[PDB]
Design a protein around this ligand. Structure first.
Ligand code: CA
Ligand code: CA
Lengths: 99, 99, 99, 99, 99, 99, 99, 99, 99, 99, 99, 99
C-alpha cells in the first residue's frame, strides 16, 4: 500500500522526465536558431564594414586621380595664359611701330 | 519566434522539475515506510520461529518420557502375566492332586 | 558567448536527465523487490503461525494418546498383581491341604 | 536492504533534479543574453547599410563635381590655345607690313 | 522518423516489462498459495492420523475401564449370592433351635 | 558512440529476454506438477476421515453394549442386596431369641 | 519440490526483468542522444544552406553593380571615339582647303 | 484455483515476452536507420562546407576579373580623351587660319 | 465436485464392507456355537433317558424282592397263628380234666 | 472410459448388495429356527430330569414303606412264635400231671 | 444366548447393506455427472482449437493481403519514379537547345 | 438342518462381501482416474485461451505495421505522381515553343 504509492510516484516521475527531455529538445532547437541568427548578423556586420572600407579607399583613390588631372590642366592653362600675355605685349609693341 | 519558443521551453522545463521533486518526496516517504513494516514483519517471523522451536523440543522430550513409562509398564505387565499363568498351572496340578 | 553558454546548458541539462532516469530505474527496481519481499514475508508469517497451531494440537493430542495407554496399562498391572496375590493365597491353602 | 538502495536512488534523484534546475537557470540567462545581442547586432547592420549608402551617394557627387571642373578647364585650355594662335597670325600679319 | 520509432519502441518495451512484472507477482502469489494449501493439507493429514490413533487409544481404555466395572460387579453379585445362601442356612438352623 | 551504446543496449536486452523465456518455462512446469500432487492429499484426507468416523461408530456402539451389561448387573445386585438385608434383619431377630 | 523450482524460477524471472529495464534505460538514453544529434545536424545543414544562399545573393549583386559600371564606361568610350573620328574628318576637310 | 491464477499469469507472461522481442527488433532497426542517416547528414555538411568555400573563391575571382576590365576601360578612356583634346585644339588652330 | 462426493461415497461404502465382514464373522461363530449346544443337549437327553431306564429297572426289581419277602412272611404268620389257636383249644381241653 | 468401468462396477456392487440382503434373510431365519429348536430340547431335558427325580424319590419312599411293613411283620411273627413256645411248655406241664 | 448375538449381528449386517445401497446410489450419480462434465470439457477444447486455427488462418491471410498491397505500391512507385527521371533528362535536353 | 442352511447363507454372504470389496476398489480407481482427466482438460483450455490471446495480439501488431507501411507508401506515391503531371505540363509548354 506504501509500495503501491511509491511505485506510482516513481512512475509519474519517469513520465515527467520524458516530458522534460522533449522540452530540452525544443530548447536546443531554439538556441541553435538564435545562435544562427546572431552568427549571420555578425557576418553581415563584417561584410559591410569591409565594403565601407573598400568604398572609402576606392573613392579616395579616384578623387586623387581627378585632382591630379585638375592640377596638370592648371599648369597647362598657366603656360597658355602666359603665352597669350606675351603675345599681347608683343602685339601692342608691333602695333605701335606701324600705326 | 524561436528565441521565445526556446525560452518558453526552458521555463516549462524548469517548472516541471518541481513536480519531479514532489514525486521524489512521495517516493522517499514510501521507502522509509516500507522499511518500518519489514522490521515489524521480521520480528514476528523471529518470534514465531522461537515459539515453534520451543514447542518441538518440549513435545519431543515429553513424548520420550511417556514412551519410557509405557515400555516400563509393558515389561512389568509381561512378568506379572507370566507369573499369573505359572501359578494358574501350578494350582491346577495341585487341585488334581486332591479331587 | 552567451548563445554558446546557453546551448551548453541545454545539452548539459540533457546529460543530467539521463542520470535522473537511471536513478529512477533503480528506485523502480527497489520497490518491486520490496513488494515481492513483503508478499513473501506475509506468507512466512502465515506458514509459521499454522505450523505453531499444528504443533500445539499435535503435541496435546499425542500426550492424550500416551496417557491413555499408560492408565490402561496401570489398570491391567494392578489386576495382574491382584490376580497373582489371590492365586498365591489359593495355592498356599491347597498345599496345606496336602502337607 | 532493497529499501536501502532504493531510497538512496531517490535521494540521488533529488540531487540530480537540483543540478538540473541549475542548468536550466543558466540556459534561461543565456537565451536572454543571446536575444539581446541579436538586437544590438541588427542595429549595427542597419547603421552600416545606411553609412554605405551615404558614402556611395557622396562619392558619386564628388566625382561629378571634379569631372565638371575638368571639362571647364579643358574648355579654357582650348580657348586660350585658340587665342594664342589667333594672336600669332595677327602678329605675323602686322610683322609683315612694316618689315 | 526512425529515431522517433525507435524511442517509441523502447518506451513500449518498457511498458510491457512492467506488465511482465505484475504477472510475475500474480505468479508468485499462486505458488505461495499452493505451498500453503499443500502444507495445510499435510497438517490435516497428520492431525487426522493423530486423532485416529488417539481414538483407538481412548476406545481401548474406555473398554478397559468398563470391563473392570463389569468384573467388579460380578464378584460383588457372586458374593452377595453366597451371603444370601449362608444367612439362609444360618437362619434355618436358628428357627429349628426354637420350633 | 551513442547510436552504438544504444544498439548495444538493445542487443543485450534481446539476449536477456531469452533467459526470461527460459525461467518462464520452468515456472510453467512447476505449477503443472502441483495440480497433480494436490488431489492426492485430498484423497488421503477423505480416506482418513472415513476411517475416523468408522472408528468412532465402533467405540460408541461398544460403549453402548458394555453400559447395557453394567446396568443389567446393577439391577441384579439390587434384588440380591435387598435379599441379604432382609435375611440379616431376620437373622438379628432370631439371635436375640437365643442370647 | 516442484513448488520450489517454480517459485525459484519466478524469482529469477524477476531479477531478469530488472536487467531488462536497465538495458531499456540505456536504449532510451541512446535514442535521445541520437535525436539531439540529428537536430544539431539538421540545423547545421540549414545554417550552411542559408549561408551559401547569402553568399550567392551578395556576389550576384556585386557583379550586377560592376557590370553596370562597365556599360557606363563603354557608353563614355564610344562617345570619345566618335568625337575623335569627327575631329579627324573635320581635320582633313580643313586640311584640304588651304593645302 | 490458485495454481490456476498462477499458471495463467505465467502464460500471459510468456506471450508478453514475444511482443517484447518484437519491439526490441523495431528498436534495433531504428538505431541502424538513425546511424545511416547521421552518415548522410555528415556528408551534406561536408559538401555544403566545401561549396560555400568554392563560392567565396569563385566570387572573389569574378570580381577581380571585372575590376580588371574596369581599369582597362579607364586607361582607354584616358587615351581617347587625350586624343580628343589634342584634336580639339588642332581643330581650332586650323579653324582660325581660314576664318 | 461431483467427483469428490462419489469418491467419498465409495470410501464410505468400503469401510461399511469391513464392518459387514466383521458382523458376518460374529454370525458364523453363533451358528457354530449353537450347533455345539444342540449336540450337547442331545447327548444329555440320551443320557437322561438311559438313567431313567436304569432307575426304573432297579426300582421295580427291589419292590418285587420286598413284595415276595412280604408274602412269604404272610404265609409263615398264618401257619403260626393257626398253631397258637390249636394249642389254646388243646390247652383248655387238658385244663378241663385237671381243674 | 474410466467413467464407464466405474459406473459398471458400481452397478455390479448394487446387484451384489441385493444378494447380500437375501443371504441375510436366510441367516436370520436360521437363528430363529435354531432358537425354537433349543427351546424344545430344553423342555425335553427338564421333563426327563423331573421324571427322573419323581422315579427315584418315589422309589426310595416305596422301599421304606415296604421295609417298615416287613419289620412290623417280623415283630408279629416273634410274638406268635413266642406264644406257641409258651403254649408247648405249658401244654407239656399239664401233660406230665395227667399222664 | 449365542443365538441372540448371531441374530443381532445379522440384523446389523442387514442395516449396513441398506447404507451400502445408499452410498452406491451416490457413486452412480457421481459417475453420470462426471461423464457429462467430461463431454462439456472436450467440447470446449475442440471449440478453442478450432477458434485458434481460425485466428491463425485469418491473420496469415491478412498479412498476405497487405504485403501484396505493399508490393503493388512499390511497383507503381518505381514506374512513377522512373518516369520523373526520364522526364527530367528529357527536359534538360530540350533546355540545352533553347538556352 | 436349519442351522446348516443358515451357516451356509452366512458363508456365501462372506464370499459376496469379498466380491463387493473388489468392485469398490474398481469404482474408486475410476473416480481417481476421472479426476485426473478433469485436471488435464482444464490446463488444455487455459493453454488454448492463452495461445489464442497471443495470436490475436501478434496479429493485430503485424497489421498495424503493414497498414502504416501502406500509408507511408501512399504518401510517396502522391508526390511522385504530382511530379510527373507537373513535368508533363511543363514539357508540353516547352514543346509548344519549339514545334
Ligand atoms: Ca546510481
Ligand atoms: Ca548495461
Amino acid at each position: 500500500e506504501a509500495a503501491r504509492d511509491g511505485l506510482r510516484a516513481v512512475m509519474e516521475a519517469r513520465n515527467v522526465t520524458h516530458l522534460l527531455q522533449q522540452e530540452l529538445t525544443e530548447a536546443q532547437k531554439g538556441f541553435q536558431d538564435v545562435e544562427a541568427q546572431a552568427a549571420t548578423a555578425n557576418h553581415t556586420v563584417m561584410a559591410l564594414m569591409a565594403s565601407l572600407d573598400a568604398e572609402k579607399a576606392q573613392g579616395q583613390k579616384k578623387v586623387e586621380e581627378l585632382e591630379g588631372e585638375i592640377t596638370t590642366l592648371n599648369h597647362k592653362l598657366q603656360d597658355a595664359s602666359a603665352e597669350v600675355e606675351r603675345l599681347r605685349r608683343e602685339n601692342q609693341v608691333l602695333s605701335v611701330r606701324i600705326a
